[PDB]
Amino acid sequence: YQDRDKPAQIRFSNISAAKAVADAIRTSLGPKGMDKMIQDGKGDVTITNDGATILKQMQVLHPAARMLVELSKAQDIEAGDGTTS
Amino acid sequence: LSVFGDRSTGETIRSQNVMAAASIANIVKSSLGPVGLDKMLVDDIGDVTITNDGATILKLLEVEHPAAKVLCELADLQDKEVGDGTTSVVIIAAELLKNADELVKQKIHPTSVISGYRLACKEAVRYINENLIVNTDELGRDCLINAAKTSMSSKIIGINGDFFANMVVDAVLAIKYTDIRG
Amino acid sequence: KAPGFAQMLKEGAKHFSGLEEAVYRNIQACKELAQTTRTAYGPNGMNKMVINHLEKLFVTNDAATILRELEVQHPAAKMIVMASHMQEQEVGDGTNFVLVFAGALLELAEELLRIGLSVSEVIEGYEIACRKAHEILPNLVCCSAKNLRDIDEVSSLLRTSIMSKQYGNEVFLAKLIAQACVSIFPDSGHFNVDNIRVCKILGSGISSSSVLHGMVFKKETEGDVTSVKDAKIAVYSCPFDGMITETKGTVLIKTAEELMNFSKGEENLMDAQVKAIADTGANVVVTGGKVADMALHYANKYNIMLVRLNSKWDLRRLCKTVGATALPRLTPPVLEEMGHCDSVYLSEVGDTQVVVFKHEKEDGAISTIVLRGSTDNLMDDIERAVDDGVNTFKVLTRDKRLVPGGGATEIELAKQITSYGETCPGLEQYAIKKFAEAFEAIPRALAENSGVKANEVISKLYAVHQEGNKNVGLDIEAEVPAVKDMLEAGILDTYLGKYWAIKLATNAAVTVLRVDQIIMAKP
Amino acid sequence: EQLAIAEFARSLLVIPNTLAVNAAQDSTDLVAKLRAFHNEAQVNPERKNLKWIGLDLSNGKPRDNKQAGVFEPTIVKVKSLKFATEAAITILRIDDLIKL
Amino acid sequence: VILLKEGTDSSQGIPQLVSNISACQVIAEAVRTTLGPRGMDKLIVDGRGKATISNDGATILKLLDVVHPAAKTLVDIAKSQDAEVGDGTTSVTLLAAEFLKQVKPYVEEGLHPQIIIRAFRTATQLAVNKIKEIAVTVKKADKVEQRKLLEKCAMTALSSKLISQQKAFFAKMVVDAVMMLDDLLQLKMIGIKKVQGGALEDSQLVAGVAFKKTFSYAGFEMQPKKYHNPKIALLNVELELKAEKDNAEIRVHTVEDYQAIVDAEWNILYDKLEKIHHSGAKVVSSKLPIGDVATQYFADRDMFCAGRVPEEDLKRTMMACGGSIQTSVNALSADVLGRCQVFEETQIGGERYNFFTGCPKAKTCTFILRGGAEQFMEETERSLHDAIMIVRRAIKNDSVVAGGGAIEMELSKYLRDYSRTIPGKQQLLIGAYAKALEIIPRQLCDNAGFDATNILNKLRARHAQGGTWYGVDINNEDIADNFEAFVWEPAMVRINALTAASEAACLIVSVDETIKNPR
Amino acid sequence: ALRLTEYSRTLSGMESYCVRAFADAMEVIPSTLAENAGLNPISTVTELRNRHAQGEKTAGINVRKGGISNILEELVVQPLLVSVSALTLATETVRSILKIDDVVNTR
């Protein structure tokens, strides 16, 4: 083929950036889910398994990764549970 | 992926936390016991502080690691609640992580490892409570003169064993006063 | 170009300057040699993995074997090695003694030279204390051999010599070597290690070994002759085949008719050659090569016993015993080059046919120890333990005096020499006290090989020897640092074994200290 | 649950191991002789087997601490095992390190 | 300038012992996954380009030829394992290298190697005494005929295979093939041949020696197959008319001599055919092909001939008919001729096959493989060979123990409780000695695709309840009793396995310095 | 995930592979809960598909006891709105991402 215009490079960039967010948070699912160490830029650290709190501290610049943050916020407004799911 | 910081996971993170906790233990390791050696503490000004107390070292020790600050706060809870054995807690807590990290390389999930320590620590308290001993040797029997005789055998005062130690027993028995609720 | 090289005027030979201390780097070469054989001393000595120049894998703890395989290229280190070759003369033990002790003198000599003492005073200090050691050693003699020639007494002495070489077989090899040694002892002054020959045979294990008289060969008799008293023996290294002259002798084979003629000719050639043997009266023929199928028929035709020996060293043993030389041609009829033997017969021991060459009429010292083993590497090491055991009693052919083993004499002799060094004023007391501490290397090397702390053993030995209790050596145990009486345990060394060993090891360390520089030259 | 509990028993041996090294003694032999005494107490109640044997730091050998008079309060040993267990769990629960 | 070694490579101390431990694990790594009947195979190619595929541990170690000196030691122990027993080379190599892995951290702590040797000598002596107590001799037990027990042991080893449906029929053939032997049992006696086509029930059990008979040439409709007492001749001579070996070339200018030369070339062939008829040999088995002209001769003489016979089938025939292999036809006589009661050419499979019957000197038989393809038969060939080994070892040694890692766990539990009763440095070493014995049941779970952790943990707790015969099941994933499942191995084989493993482990530890003489 | 596989067989065209991929992606939730519970993620999901085929929704994963048991008997229940809103909101986001060909920066 040729494909002078390649939209797939944006599709593959959006999928890879979106999957990278779900790959980290998936370990916190369930009561037995593992914890994490979040080190803020000032040097402060904390330990929490809450998925909604971690996503607010991610500070994602990628557009596809930002829509997942807004997706988790819309779930807490309607049902209020199942943010990580 | 575009992020403002670094992110890493895997067996390396758990390995770094075990090696960090092992470094704090090795510092207070050789200082355990009454014969433990002294250790210097150097500040940024260049002053030196020397002592064998493990509880004093951990308070003045400064090492920046996420996991290392957990054990430092742990000694404060043991000190404020009881005040003795803070050195033994740090040493045991490190040996637990050394053997647990080996089980992870055996493909043992950490949850099964955590469930083991909770059952082992629970059965340990039950077995200790049976092997305990209450207050005794206050009447009808004396092996309590040998109580202070062992601690006095390491000094020149231990030349006469029963002469000097008999007055220590009569001193601690004469000072008994309730002052609260029996 | 200036500045020039320091101290090197000759053939580019490296010359260590004053600050370089050429004496120490010569001691360093002899120090590394002792560290290799230090771990092989004692019954617990570690085995060494040795690769032969033929790329054969050998595993042995023997020190004499290591020095042959490991090439020592340092000149000052050869002096200790050459002292070990002289150590094998007049006694068959003490090889590990010289390598460890000569190095101990040089290690402690480095401490004295750093103090600023002259090298000449260190030399005079050892030669004075060495004469004191030869005077005290007779006083350390406890018990001696009863000279009863009894197997119980003869096998009891081999327990120490067999130890440190083959472990676990100490009980078995004690009685086996004893039976062969008690046969020669009735002959005064005739005892020789070359008279007892060892022949190893592949088999089950060492427990299947036995002792026989005469010369026992593992190769059976090719002929059907059982026993013959014929004294004429002709050793022939040439294999039996069609006789070929040293001249041209071109044989042209064209047609099958001529092929059968020259084929029957070889049968006629082997016929006249074997006939010449029976004409001279020799019924015993030794073959160094192979044997033809037709030669076996003419051997039984003339009733001549046939022996096939593939080993070359087995042929040289007959040349120096009966006196039968091996001629290059095929069965030359020469009576002058034959041997003499009183009795020749075929025997079977251990389900194996063996040939026996002994002397019935003449007494003789000839005897043979047959060995059996599964692995040739482990079976060959047994032969090394037999030679050290036989050579132990070659010394007892002289005056019989025994000294305690297990480092018992080393502590007793170091305690007495220290007393003489304290009473002697001057600067000679430094080299004498260091000469006494050189004896401490043996019990330390013996304790480290057993997995026991060295300083704990040395401390206990001075405590028991200070109270006047002699005969106390080192008990061999992994978990027990303590000691036991050597006299009741049966561990005893040889007087002349220690006597010649201290003298040779002393002159070996003195000669190295005399050489301050090594210079290469050209012919 | 076997490997998790079994490794908890080996981890407790560091306390008699550390005290043996600081006492200028062989740690392997003292811990070995110490384990042999407490085992015979679990086999049979009979008195001929040693019970409640501790370690002597001065002489470097086993010694009975009941007669010697070297004791420690109960709340010291009990709370030491609980806090040490909670610390080993808290550090182990961290599967990730995230920086900003 | 003056150097002691001068290129001599030598090292001693702790690093030399540690380097040998890492070298022994490399040798055990290659045969590690090949343990067990279900273990994975290996592929080794030589300099010729041909690939060898099999899970046999003895064959793989021979092809490796590792130049490391300590590696050659473990290889030599496997060779001594064949002469004493003949199997278990994979178990000895894998187990011996496991002891070095457990004591490896203790060596770096300053422990002296001699103390380690004292532990392996004492613990192994106690393991031998424990095996002799557990071993139970089963002969007349429950008044069951020994043939029934041999079939049940064969169906277990052949279960969960391609023949697992037909294993009930094949179990009878394996037991019967062993019963046809003499009092001296040998695995090299019984041969196995493969025949394509037909179902698994079509497999035939021949009491005599059969071969593929690749002979494609002419001579049909003659040479009656039935012979009551034929003389079996073994000849490597080539009877082909125009052959690469025996020809006749003579150049003459005479025309009348050409008729004789052509006849002389046929005379040499006619003489070789006459010398066979001179001795009266009815059956002619040739290794080299036989021409069509030589087939017509024997056809009119009422004698049969077959060529293109492998050399191994001729050697099995030599031990069968009772004769000997003769190269030429000149020395052929009644001494090298054999005898058989029934000789018949069978059409089974559509190919022509020949076999003997009732040979007086025959200790051997032949089995026929019938399947859909060659890979079904080649794997079944060794699968049935393992079943013959179980039946053979069960007859020789009647005192056995439970296999499948069952005896390995009891020796681990017994020595674990005894190690606590020995105060000293022997406690930690014997404790590591028992743990190293658990590598055998662990590798069986990994090679079978199961979960090694869940099986081994539940199995270890089961031995605490007193059952000594429980072990790992290779078919279903569960803890089962190998004694009731009839998985048995001789007690003397397991004793020699621990003795050879302990001896090879103590020898590597006893090595201190490696000296190499440059040459 | 089990029932959508049967519906993928009745459909035709590209909807066969697309719906099947949507069904197989629903097994990540039970595979994650089994991993944090100390079990085998691959073997646990396989057993649940059989129990849900023959049985009812009762089969599941119990994280407290660390094994497969009845979810209703373990007092584990969630409202329906949580699961329905989870599929609806996630689908609208996935469809929105697939409709983006390129991003353009303006000023």
Side-chain angles (χ1 to χ4, degrees), chain C residues 387-414:
Chain C
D387 290 344
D388 290 344
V390 175
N391 290 336
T392 299
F393 294 160
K394 184 173 179 290
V395 176
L396 294 177
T397 59
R398 295 182 182 175
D399 55 351
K400 294 177 178 178
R401 295 181 181 276
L402 296 175
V403 295
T409 59
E410 296 302 321
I411 303 301
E412 296 176 352
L413 180 62

mmCIF file of all heavy atoms in Angstrom, chain C residues 387-414:
data_model
loop_
_atom_site.group_PDB
_atom_site.id
_atom_site.type_symbol
_atom_site.label_atom_id
_atom_site.label_comp_id
_atom_site.label_asym_id
_atom_site.label_seq_id
_atom_site.Cartn_x
_atom_site.Cartn_y
_atom_site.Cartn_z
ATOM 1 N N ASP C 387 54.262 -46.919 48.087
ATOM 2 C CA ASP C 387 55.674 -46.551 48.039
ATOM 3 C C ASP C 387 56.078 -45.744 49.265
ATOM 4 O O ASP C 387 57.194 -45.898 49.775
ATOM 5 C CB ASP C 387 55.970 -45.770 46.759
ATOM 6 C CG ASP C 387 55.890 -46.635 45.519
ATOM 7 O OD1 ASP C 387 55.910 -47.877 45.655
ATOM 8 O OD2 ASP C 387 55.808 -46.074 44.406
ATOM 9 N N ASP C 388 55.187 -44.881 49.755
ATOM 10 C CA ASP C 388 55.483 -44.136 50.974
ATOM 11 C C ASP C 388 55.471 -45.043 52.197
ATOM 12 O O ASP C 388 56.177 -44.771 53.175
ATOM 13 C CB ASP C 388 54.486 -42.991 51.148
ATOM 14 C CG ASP C 388 54.680 -41.888 50.124
ATOM 15 O OD1 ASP C 388 55.750 -41.853 49.481
ATOM 16 O OD2 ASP C 388 53.762 -41.057 49.962
ATOM 17 N N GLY C 389 54.687 -46.118 52.161
ATOM 18 C CA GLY C 389 54.647 -47.065 53.256
ATOM 19 C C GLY C 389 55.847 -47.988 53.280
ATOM 20 O O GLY C 389 56.386 -48.289 54.349
ATOM 21 N N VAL C 390 56.271 -48.449 52.102
ATOM 22 C CA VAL C 390 57.437 -49.323 52.026
ATOM 23 C C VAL C 390 58.705 -48.555 52.373
ATOM 24 O O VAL C 390 59.568 -49.053 53.105
ATOM 25 C CB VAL C 390 57.528 -49.969 50.631
ATOM 26 C CG1 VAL C 390 58.804 -50.786 50.506
ATOM 27 C CG2 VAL C 390 56.309 -50.840 50.372
ATOM 28 N N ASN C 391 58.836 -47.328 51.863
ATOM 29 C CA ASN C 391 60.003 -46.510 52.172
ATOM 30 C C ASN C 391 60.069 -46.124 53.642
ATOM 31 O O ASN C 391 61.148 -45.771 54.129
ATOM 32 C CB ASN C 391 60.011 -45.252 51.305
ATOM 33 C CG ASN C 391 60.306 -45.551 49.851
ATOM 34 O OD1 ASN C 391 60.922 -46.566 49.528
ATOM 35 N ND2 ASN C 391 59.866 -44.667 48.963
ATOM 36 N N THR C 392 58.942 -46.175 54.357
ATOM 37 C CA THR C 392 58.965 -45.892 55.787
ATOM 38 C C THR C 392 59.785 -46.933 56.539
ATOM 39 O O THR C 392 60.574 -46.591 57.428
ATOM 40 C CB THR C 392 57.540 -45.836 56.338
ATOM 41 O OG1 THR C 392 56.811 -44.793 55.679
ATOM 42 C CG2 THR C 392 57.556 -45.567 57.835
ATOM 43 N N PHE C 393 59.619 -48.208 56.191
ATOM 44 C CA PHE C 393 60.374 -49.277 56.830
ATOM 45 C C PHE C 393 61.769 -49.451 56.249
ATOM 46 O O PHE C 393 62.603 -50.120 56.871
ATOM 47 C CB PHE C 393 59.605 -50.596 56.733
ATOM 48 C CG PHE C 393 58.325 -50.602 57.514
ATOM 49 C CD1 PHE C 393 57.318 -51.505 57.222
ATOM 50 C CD2 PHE C 393 58.127 -49.694 58.542
ATOM 51 C CE1 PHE C 393 56.142 -51.501 57.944
ATOM 52 C CE2 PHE C 393 56.954 -49.688 59.267
ATOM 53 C CZ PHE C 393 55.960 -50.595 58.969
ATOM 54 N N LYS C 394 62.042 -48.873 55.078
ATOM 55 C CA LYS C 394 63.411 -48.848 54.579
ATOM 56 C C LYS C 394 64.308 -48.029 55.496
ATOM 57 O O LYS C 394 65.509 -48.304 55.604
ATOM 58 C CB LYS C 394 63.441 -48.289 53.156
ATOM 59 C CG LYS C 394 64.813 -48.308 52.502
ATOM 60 C CD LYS C 394 64.729 -47.897 51.042
ATOM 61 C CE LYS C 394 66.103 -47.888 50.392
ATOM 62 N NZ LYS C 394 66.953 -46.777 50.902
ATOM 63 N N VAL C 395 63.739 -47.029 56.172
ATOM 64 C CA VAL C 395 64.494 -46.271 57.162
ATOM 65 C C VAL C 395 64.671 -47.080 58.442
ATOM 66 O O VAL C 395 65.731 -47.019 59.077
ATOM 67 C CB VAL C 395 63.800 -44.926 57.437
ATOM 68 C CG1 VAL C 395 64.524 -44.162 58.532
ATOM 69 C CG2 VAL C 395 63.729 -44.102 56.162
ATOM 70 N N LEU C 396 63.659 -47.857 58.834
ATOM 71 C CA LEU C 396 63.761 -48.664 60.044
ATOM 72 C C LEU C 396 64.708 -49.846 59.889
ATOM 73 O O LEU C 396 64.974 -50.533 60.880
ATOM 74 C CB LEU C 396 62.380 -49.158 60.473
ATOM 75 C CG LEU C 396 61.408 -48.068 60.926
ATOM 76 C CD1 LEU C 396 60.050 -48.660 61.257
ATOM 77 C CD2 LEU C 396 61.971 -47.312 62.119
ATOM 78 N N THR C 397 65.212 -50.109 58.680
ATOM 79 C CA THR C 397 66.309 -51.060 58.543
ATOM 80 C C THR C 397 67.545 -50.569 59.283
ATOM 81 O O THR C 397 68.362 -51.377 59.740
ATOM 82 C CB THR C 397 66.629 -51.293 57.066
ATOM 83 O OG1 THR C 397 66.983 -50.049 56.450
ATOM 84 C CG2 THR C 397 65.424 -51.882 56.350
ATOM 85 N N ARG C 398 67.695 -49.252 59.408
ATOM 86 C CA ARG C 398 68.705 -48.645 60.264
ATOM 87 C C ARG C 398 68.189 -48.603 61.697
ATOM 88 O O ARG C 398 67.212 -49.283 62.024
ATOM 89 C CB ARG C 398 69.060 -47.243 59.768
ATOM 90 C CG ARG C 398 69.735 -47.230 58.409
ATOM 91 C CD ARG C 398 70.104 -45.821 57.983
ATOM 92 N NE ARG C 398 70.716 -45.798 56.658
ATOM 93 C CZ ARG C 398 71.047 -44.688 56.009
ATOM 94 N NH1 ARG C 398 70.827 -43.503 56.562
ATOM 95 N NH2 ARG C 398 71.600 -44.760 54.805
ATOM 96 N N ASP C 399 68.854 -47.837 62.560
ATOM 97 C CA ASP C 399 68.427 -47.705 63.949
ATOM 98 C C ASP C 399 66.952 -47.333 64.042
ATOM 99 O O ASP C 399 66.460 -46.491 63.284
ATOM 100 C CB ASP C 399 69.297 -46.667 64.665
ATOM 101 C CG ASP C 399 69.314 -45.320 63.957
ATOM 102 O OD1 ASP C 399 68.793 -45.220 62.826
ATOM 103 O OD2 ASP C 399 69.857 -44.355 64.536
ATOM 104 N N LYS C 400 66.245 -47.980 64.968
ATOM 105 C CA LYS C 400 64.795 -47.830 65.093
ATOM 106 C C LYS C 400 64.497 -46.893 66.256
ATOM 107 O O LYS C 400 64.699 -47.226 67.423
ATOM 108 C CB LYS C 400 64.131 -49.188 65.286
ATOM 109 C CG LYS C 400 64.237 -50.109 64.082
ATOM 110 C CD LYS C 400 63.621 -51.469 64.369
ATOM 111 C CE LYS C 400 63.686 -52.372 63.149
ATOM 112 N NZ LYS C 400 63.120 -53.721 63.421
ATOM 113 N N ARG C 401 64.003 -45.702 65.925
ATOM 114 C CA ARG C 401 63.571 -44.716 66.907
ATOM 115 C C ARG C 401 62.325 -44.032 66.371
ATOM 116 O O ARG C 401 62.268 -43.685 65.187
ATOM 117 C CB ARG C 401 64.670 -43.685 67.189
ATOM 118 C CG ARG C 401 65.918 -44.248 67.850
ATOM 119 C CD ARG C 401 66.935 -43.153 68.119
ATOM 120 N NE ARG C 401 68.149 -43.671 68.741
ATOM 121 C CZ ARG C 401 68.292 -43.872 70.047
ATOM 122 N NH1 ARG C 401 67.291 -43.597 70.874
ATOM 123 N NH2 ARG C 401 69.432 -44.346 70.529
ATOM 124 N N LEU C 402 61.330 -43.842 67.232
ATOM 125 C CA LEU C 402 60.055 -43.276 66.823
ATOM 126 C C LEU C 402 59.747 -42.022 67.631
ATOM 127 O O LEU C 402 60.002 -41.951 68.834
ATOM 128 C CB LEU C 402 58.919 -44.294 66.985
ATOM 129 C CG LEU C 402 59.016 -45.549 66.115
ATOM 130 C CD1 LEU C 402 57.904 -46.527 66.457
ATOM 131 C CD2 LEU C 402 58.983 -45.188 64.638
ATOM 132 N N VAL C 403 59.189 -41.029 66.947
ATOM 133 C CA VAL C 403 58.782 -39.774 67.578
ATOM 134 C C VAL C 403 57.292 -39.570 67.358
ATOM 135 O O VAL C 403 56.725 -40.014 66.351
ATOM 136 C CB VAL C 403 59.574 -38.570 67.028
ATOM 137 C CG1 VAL C 403 61.046 -38.700 67.381
ATOM 138 C CG2 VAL C 403 59.394 -38.454 65.523
ATOM 139 N N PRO C 404 56.626 -38.915 68.309
ATOM 140 C CA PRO C 404 55.183 -38.679 68.177
ATOM 141 C C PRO C 404 54.857 -37.840 66.952
ATOM 142 O O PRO C 404 55.632 -36.992 66.508
ATOM 143 C CB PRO C 404 54.828 -37.941 69.471
ATOM 144 C CG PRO C 404 55.864 -38.389 70.443
ATOM 145 C CD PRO C 404 57.126 -38.529 69.641
ATOM 146 N N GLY C 405 53.676 -38.098 66.395
ATOM 147 C CA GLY C 405 53.205 -37.356 65.245
ATOM 148 C C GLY C 405 52.101 -36.378 65.589
ATOM 149 O O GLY C 405 51.872 -36.081 66.766
ATOM 150 N N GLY C 406 51.406 -35.876 64.571
ATOM 151 C CA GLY C 406 50.324 -34.934 64.803
ATOM 152 C C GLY C 406 50.770 -33.618 65.395
ATOM 153 O O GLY C 406 50.029 -33.011 66.176
ATOM 154 N N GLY C 407 51.968 -33.158 65.046
ATOM 155 C CA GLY C 407 52.483 -31.912 65.571
ATOM 156 C C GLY C 407 52.866 -31.941 67.031
ATOM 157 O O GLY C 407 52.969 -30.874 67.647
ATOM 158 N N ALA C 408 53.080 -33.125 67.608
ATOM 159 C CA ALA C 408 53.451 -33.200 69.017
ATOM 160 C C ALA C 408 54.905 -32.798 69.229
ATOM 161 O O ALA C 408 55.221 -32.066 70.173
ATOM 162 C CB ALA C 408 53.197 -34.608 69.552
ATOM 163 N N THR C 409 55.804 -33.268 68.362
ATOM 164 C CA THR C 409 57.216 -32.928 68.510
ATOM 165 C C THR C 409 57.478 -31.479 68.123
ATOM 166 O O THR C 409 58.412 -30.851 68.637
ATOM 167 C CB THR C 409 58.079 -33.866 67.668
ATOM 168 O OG1 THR C 409 57.692 -33.765 66.291
ATOM 169 C CG2 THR C 409 57.913 -35.301 68.132
ATOM 170 N N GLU C 410 56.668 -30.930 67.215
ATOM 171 C CA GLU C 410 56.879 -29.557 66.772
ATOM 172 C C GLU C 410 56.660 -28.558 67.900
ATOM 173 O O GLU C 410 57.362 -27.545 67.972
ATOM 174 C CB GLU C 410 55.961 -29.238 65.594
ATOM 175 C CG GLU C 410 56.249 -30.062 64.353
ATOM 176 C CD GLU C 410 57.674 -29.896 63.860
ATOM 177 O OE1 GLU C 410 58.196 -28.763 63.913
ATOM 178 O OE2 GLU C 410 58.271 -30.900 63.418
ATOM 179 N N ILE C 411 55.702 -28.823 68.783
ATOM 180 C CA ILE C 411 55.469 -27.950 69.929
ATOM 181 C C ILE C 411 56.508 -28.181 71.018
ATOM 182 O O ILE C 411 56.970 -27.231 71.656
ATOM 183 C CB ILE C 411 54.038 -28.156 70.461
ATOM 184 C CG1 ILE C 411 53.019 -27.899 69.351
ATOM 185 C CG2 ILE C 411 53.769 -27.242 71.643
ATOM 186 C CD1 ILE C 411 53.090 -26.504 68.772
ATOM 187 N N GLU C 412 56.896 -29.439 71.239
ATOM 188 C CA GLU C 412 57.889 -29.738 72.265
ATOM 189 C C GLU C 412 59.263 -29.207 71.879
ATOM 190 O O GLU C 412 60.020 -28.744 72.740
ATOM 191 C CB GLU C 412 57.948 -31.245 72.509
ATOM 192 C CG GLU C 412 56.668 -31.829 73.076
ATOM 193 C CD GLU C 412 56.724 -33.336 73.218
ATOM 194 O OE1 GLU C 412 57.697 -33.946 72.729
ATOM 195 O OE2 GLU C 412 55.788 -33.912 73.811
ATOM 196 N N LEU C 413 59.602 -29.263 70.589
ATOM 197 C CA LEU C 413 60.908 -28.788 70.151
ATOM 198 C C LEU C 413 60.951 -27.267 70.067
ATOM 199 O O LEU C 413 62.007 -26.665 70.296
ATOM 200 C CB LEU C 413 61.267 -29.416 68.804
ATOM 201 C CG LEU C 413 62.609 -29.040 68.180
ATOM 202 C CD1 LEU C 413 63.755 -29.484 69.072
ATOM 203 C CD2 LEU C 413 62.738 -29.654 66.794
ATOM 204 N N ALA C 414 59.822 -26.629 69.751
ATOM 205 C CA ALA C 414 59.786 -25.171 69.716
ATOM 206 C C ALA C 414 59.819 -24.576 71.117
ATOM 207 O O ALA C 414 60.263 -23.437 71.295
ATOM 208 C CB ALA C 414 58.544 -24.690 68.967
#
